Amino acid sequence: KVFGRCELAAAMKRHGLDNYRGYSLGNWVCAAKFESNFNTQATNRNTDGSTDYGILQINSRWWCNDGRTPGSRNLCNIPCSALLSSDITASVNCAKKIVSDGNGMNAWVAWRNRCKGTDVQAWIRGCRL
Ligand SMILES: CN(C)CCCN1CCN(Cc2cccc(C(=O)O)n2)CCN(Cc2cccc(C(=O)O)n2)CC1
Ligand SMILES: [Cl-]
Ligand SMILES: [Cl-]
Ligand SMILES: [Cl-]
Ligand SMILES: [Cl-]
Ligand SMILES: [Cl-]
Ligand SMILES: [Cl-]
Ligand code: NA
Ligand SMILES: [Tb+3]
Numbered sequence: 001k002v003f004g005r006c007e008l009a010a011a012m013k014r015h016g017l018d019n020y021r022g023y024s025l026g027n028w029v030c031a032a033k034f035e036s037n038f039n040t041q042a043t044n045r046n047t048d049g050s051t052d053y054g055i056l057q058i059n060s061r062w063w064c065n066d067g068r069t070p071g072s073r074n075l076c077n078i079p080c081s082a083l084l085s086s087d088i089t090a091s092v093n094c095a096k097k098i099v100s101d102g103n104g105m106n107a108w109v110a111w112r113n114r115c116k117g118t119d120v121q122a123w124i125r126g127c128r129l
Pocket of ligand 3: 065066067068069070071072
């Protein structure tokens with residue numbers, strides 16, 4: 001599924017991401033834009049052999065199992081394919097675990113380089129939330 005911007009905002013809000021660990025909703029929408037372009041089916045292979053999955057490009061090195069990342073963990077206890085569904089529940093629950101780790105949203109390199117410090121509220125402007 002390719003979400004619309006306000007569609008994704010509404011879904012993230014309903015699953016409790018707005019203000020989660022102090023990160024306003026626009027931070028999460030911005031992260032999703034530059035991680036996946038709002039595409040739940042996005043996948044990208046990393047240099048180390050791990051793969052990033054879904055709307056928030058969650059990495060198999062730590063968070064999900066894809067059977068092809070030797071030595072990795074599965075801390076969200078989920079197949080990585082579950083992060084590609086049109087229903088973002090699994091991605092949101094896993095994201096909550098990720099952002100609760102010591103580094104906050106810096107875990108998402110695209111958030112750090114493209115969202116952090118910018119006017120992230122723009123990403124929810126005009127949305128009926
Ligand atoms: C930059 N890296 C690519 C991020 C990877 C972060 N983790 C690295 C090792 N991590 C341990 C660790 C050691 C020292 C620093 C950090 C950190 O900055 O989080 N984490 C294992 C635990 N896993 C989840 C978890 C669950 C509960 C508590 C904690 C925690 O207290 O850190 N962590 C997170 C993976
Ligand atoms: Cl957009
Ligand atoms: Cl694996
Ligand atoms: Cl594990
Ligand atoms: Cl959904
Ligand atoms: Cl933080
Ligand atoms: Cl915001
Ligand atoms: Na893994
Ligand atoms: Tb950690």
